[PDB]
Amino acid sequence: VLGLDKRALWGALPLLGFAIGHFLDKKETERMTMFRDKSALYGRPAGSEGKAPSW
Amino acid sequence: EKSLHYLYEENEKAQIRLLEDEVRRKMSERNDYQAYYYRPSVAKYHRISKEAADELEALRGD
Ligand SMILES: CCCCCCCCCCCC
Numbered sequence A: 001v002l003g004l005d006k007r008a009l010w011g012a013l014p015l016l017g018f019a020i021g022h023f024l025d026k027k028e029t030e031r032m033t034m035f036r037d038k039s040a041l042y043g044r045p046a047g048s049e050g051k052a053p054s055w
Numbered sequence B: 001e002k003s004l005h006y007l008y009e010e011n012e013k014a015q016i017r018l019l020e021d022e023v024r025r026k027m028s029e030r031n032d033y034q035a036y037y038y039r040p041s042v043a044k045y046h047r048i049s050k051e052a053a054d055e056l057e058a059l060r061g062d
């Protein structure tokens, strides 16, 4: 049994901050796209770039 | 690979910071460039006073 009364509707703002931080983490993942497949450990050689990116 | 990208960016930033440290040290050692360590001295006021004394030679008389 939860104990969240009508004052728990204020808590949408920290979840909005969670969404803002998650969006900024996704944008920083998009920013670091150099060496996405060019690394020597997980990178396939040339001629196989037609597939989808890993992340 | 995000660690690889951030390490490449931070290593290039460290290399450029070291290079600009040597560039600033050699610039401040010899005072060569006009930008950072140059203490500007002008001969504008000496030329202005010499020009004014040159015009005052023509106005001497009666
Ligand atoms: C006392 C009423 C509290 C809920 C309404 C005011 C706060 C709304 C916050 C909305 C965040 C997205």
Ligand SMILES: CCCCCCCC
Pocket: A020, A023
């Ligand atoms: C500190 C940034 C707050 C606003 C983020 C907006 C993202 C769409």
